[PDB]
């Protein structure tokens, strides 16, 4: 009788590992995969926000594809008010990050009781007087090259690609179309074209204002939409500038060009997010799993943070319990190597936002136990490149020792998070407690898998040896109070020699006070 799927863990074959997965092997307390929850009408309440942190929300995503600067700021203040509430106890405190999502290049319909019928004609008018008053046969789109670059025999998608069309005319400002799949047209719904790469700006003027607002707001990360090359990301960084240099950029991949130029995009970006709801419209849907598994895998081999994002638990927008396809996907995502798992409408405009976060908390914890670490660690090391970096050797050594003694933690003193980040790329079962005094680092650290960031508001003792131990004691107390580990249990502590970032070379396997 045992825990953490340990019988499977020591299975010599992956097939045997699955045969030994036990629904009667209760999981460890700590959850490694990060939960990102989009905030909006359902969750913007500090009452909901306080309870979302309680239910395991680690990051708050703001979608500028919708809304205004005033709306989001009210939410960002509201999220920050909720987080400071649990700060009376620093040990029980959880830092919560704020992320910004760009509208990006989008084609949107004009301003609902019109249903498009199969066998009907629709003309995509480009007279801009239908922007507020759009008829069924007269449709205005916020794009100028649809008719120009989409010719007869093409197809168009509106409202999450739920209303399909077929093109029978090409020209200037007009498009005669058939409705292949019909339905109730909605106001200002997204237009998607599978057969073209939009010519619209990857970073528009609204995007420049939206990114600028975040630098004024102290956002820890940003989610760049419709990124098709590294050129797109660099434009985003220059807009963030010197005051946002430390703001992490996560590029959202939702297009064929990005999937092709993905390797260039990853080296450029600070992380990747698989935007499935958009990526599925552009490429055939039955090919999307390959893209998620391809990107999560490449991101893991480069130690760059990857997020799984859309329609994970969608039924929960209207339902209190999730479908089995949904439950399987959230776990398969953690099983695939996703650092963070996200919720969109489920949390933003949902009947059950808290219920969704809790499900993502449970299914994730169970999957982390199910991972074949022995194979995974073998491959990440086998595919690791030999370096003379001290921190890199110490980090791989700490994870190997965590596996050997079955540690209840890996404790890292990190000022920029980079030390703890390298331990995470090696994918330990041991929970990583990054002890930091840089608060933004504590929030941005949530992007990586396994890192439970802890903020030491305790002052500098003026003796590095005393100050370092003071911090190590803070981590020991947190893992005990949260029940991650117990006194007398072994832990790994990573530290350096000189004060300052980049001096990490010290590995300590120690029992807990």
The answer to the question of whether 189 is labelled as a binding residue is yes
Q: Which string of DSSP letters, residue by residue, matches 260-325?
A: HTHHHHHHHSSEEEE-HHHHHHHS-GGGHHHHHHHHHHHHHHTT--EEE-SSSSGGGGT-SS--HH
Among the listed residues 46, 230, 470, 507, the single contact to a second copy using CB under 8 A: 507
Q: Please, are residues 344 and 310 in contact by the beta-carbon 8 Å criterion?
A: yes
Look at residue 346 and give its three-state secondary structure.
helix
Q: Judged by CB, which is closer to a second copy: 42, or 219?
A: 42
State whether the Cα torsion 142-145-148-149 is positive or negative: negative
CA 313 to chain centre: 15
Q: Judged by CB, which is closer to a second copy: 73, or 470?
A: 470
399: DSSP letter = H
The answer to the question of whether 123 is labelled as a binding residue is no
Per CB under 8 A, which of residues 73..92 are in contact with a second copy?
A: none
Stretch that binds a second copy, among 57-65, 144-152, 405-413, 452-460 (CB under 8 A): 405-413
80 classed as catalytic: no
Residue 432 lies near a second copy (rule: CB under 8 A): no
- CB under 8 Å to 241, separation ≥6 — which residues? 215
276 classed as catalytic: no
Q: Please, are residues 183 and 214 in contact by the beta-carbon 8 Å criterion?
A: no
Stretch that binds a second copy, among 33-41, 76-84, 224-232, 319-327 (CB under 8 A): 319-327
For the CB of residue 328, give the shortest distance to a second copy in the complex, in Å.
4
Do β-strands 176-178 and 163-167 pair in parallel, antiparallel, or remain unpaired?
Answer: antiparallel
CA 88 to chain centre: 28
Per CB under 8 A, which of residues 454..493 are in contact with a second copy?
A: 490, 492
Per CB under 8 A, which of residues 362..381 are in contact with a second copy?
A: 362-363, 365-367, 370, 374-376, 378-381
The answer to the question of whether 499 is labelled as a binding residue is yes
| Interface characters, 101-140, with a second copy (x: CB under 8 A) | ----------------------------------------
The answer to the question of whether 501 is labelled as a binding residue is yes
222/219 Cα distance (integer angstroms): 7
Q: Judged by CB, which is closer to a second copy: 332, or 416?
A: 332
The answer to the question of whether 500 is labelled as a binding residue is yes
206 classed as catalytic: no
Per CB under 8 A, which of residues 281..310 are in contact with a second copy?
A: 283-294, 296-298, 300-301, 310
Residue 158 lies near a second copy (rule: CB under 8 A): no
For the CB of residue 366, give the shortest distance to a second copy in the complex, in Å.
5
Residue 277 lies near a second copy (rule: CB under 8 A): yes
The answer to the question of whether 414 is labelled as a binding residue is yes
Helix H or strand E encompassing 213: helix 205-217
Which of left, alpha, beta for 456 (phi over 0: left; psi -120 to 50: alpha)?
beta
Residue 392 lies near a second copy (rule: CB under 8 A): yes
Among the listed residues 127, 267, 389, 466, the single contact to a second copy using CB under 8 A: 389
The structure tokens 């994002």 sit at: 309
Residue 319 lies near a second copy (rule: CB under 8 A): yes
Per CB under 8 A, which of residues 171..210 are in contact with a second copy?
A: 181, 183
Active-site annotation holder among 31, 228, 252, 276: 252
11/175 Cα distance (integer angstroms): 60
3-state SS track over 72-90: HHHHHHHHHHHHHHCCCCC
343/357 Cα distance (integer angstroms): 8
The answer to the question of whether 102 is labelled as a binding residue is yes
The answer to the question of whether 58 is labelled as a binding residue is yes
Q: Please, are residues 330 and 359 in contact by the beta-carbon 8 Å criterion?
A: yes
252 classed as catalytic: yes
* Residue set of the binding site: 58, 61, 63-66, 94, 101-102, 108, 189, 252, 254, 277-278, 310, 414-419, 446, 464, 471, 498-503
């Amino acid at each position: 009788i045992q825990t953490q799927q340990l019988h499977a863990a020591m299975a010599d074959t992956f097939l045997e590992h699955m045969c030994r997965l036990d629904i009667d092997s209760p999981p460890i307390t700590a959850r490694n995969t990060g939960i990102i929850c989009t905030i909006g009408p359902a969750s913007r309440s500090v009452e909901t926000l306080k309870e979302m942190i309680k239910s395991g929300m680690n990051v708050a995503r703001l979608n500028f594809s919708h809304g205004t600067h005033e709306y989001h700021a009210e939410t960002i203040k509201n999220v920050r008010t909720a987080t400071e509430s649990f700060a009376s106890d620093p040990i029980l405190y959880r830092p919560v990050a704020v992320a910004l999502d760009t509208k990006g290049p989008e084609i949107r319909t004009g301003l609902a009781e019109v249903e498009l019928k199969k066998g009907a004609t629709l003309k995509i008018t480009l007279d801009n007087a239908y922007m507020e008053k759009c008829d069924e046969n007269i449709l205005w789109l916020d794009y100028k090259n649809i008719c120009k670059v989409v010719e007869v025999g093409s197809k168009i998608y509106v409202d999450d690609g739920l209303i399909s069309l077929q093109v029978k005319q090409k020209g200037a400002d007009f498009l005669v179309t058939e409705v292949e799949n019909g339905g109730s047209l909605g106001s200002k719904k997204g237009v998607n074209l599978p057969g073209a790469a939009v010519d619209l700006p990857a970073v528009s003027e609204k995007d420049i204002q939206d990114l600028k607002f975040g630098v004024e707001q102290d956002v820890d990360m940003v989610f760049a939409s419709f990124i098709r090359k590294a050129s797109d990301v660099h434009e985003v960084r220059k807009v963030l500038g010197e005051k946002g240099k430390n703001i992490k950029i996560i590029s959202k991949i939702e297009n064929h060009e990005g999937v092709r130029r993905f390797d260039e995009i990853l080296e450029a970006s600070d992380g990747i997010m698989v935007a499935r709801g958009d990526l599925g419209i552009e490429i055939p849907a039955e090919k999307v799993f390959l893209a998620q598994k391809m990107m999560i895998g490449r991101c893991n081999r480069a130690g760059k943070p990857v997020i799984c994002a859309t329609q994970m638990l969608e039924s929960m927008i209207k339902k209190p319990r999730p479908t089995r396809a949904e439950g399987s996907d959230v776990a398969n995502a953690v099983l695939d190597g996703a650092d963070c798992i996200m919720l969109s409408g489920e949390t933003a405009k949902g009947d059950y936002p808290l219920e969704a976060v809790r499900m993502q908390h449970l299914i994730a914890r169970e999957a982390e136990a199910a991972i074949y670490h022995l194979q995974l660690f073998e491959e990440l090391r086998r595919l690791a490149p030999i370096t003379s970096d001290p921190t890199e050797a110490t980090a791989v050594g700490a994870v190997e020792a965590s596996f050997k003694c079955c540690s209840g933690a890996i404790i890292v003193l990190t000022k920029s998070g980079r030390s703890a980040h390298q331990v995470a790329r090696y994918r330990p079962r041991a929970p990583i407690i990054a002890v930091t005094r840089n608060p933004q680092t504590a929030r941005q650290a949530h992007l990586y898998r396994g890192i439970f960031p802890v903020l030491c508001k305790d002052p500098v003792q003026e003796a590095w040896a005393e100050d370092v131990d003071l911090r190590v004691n803070f981590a020991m107390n947190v893992g005990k109070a949260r029940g991650f580990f117990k006194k007398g249990d072994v832990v790994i502590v990573l530290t350096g020699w000189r004060p300052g970032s980049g001096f990490t070379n010290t590995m300590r396997v120690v029992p807990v006070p």
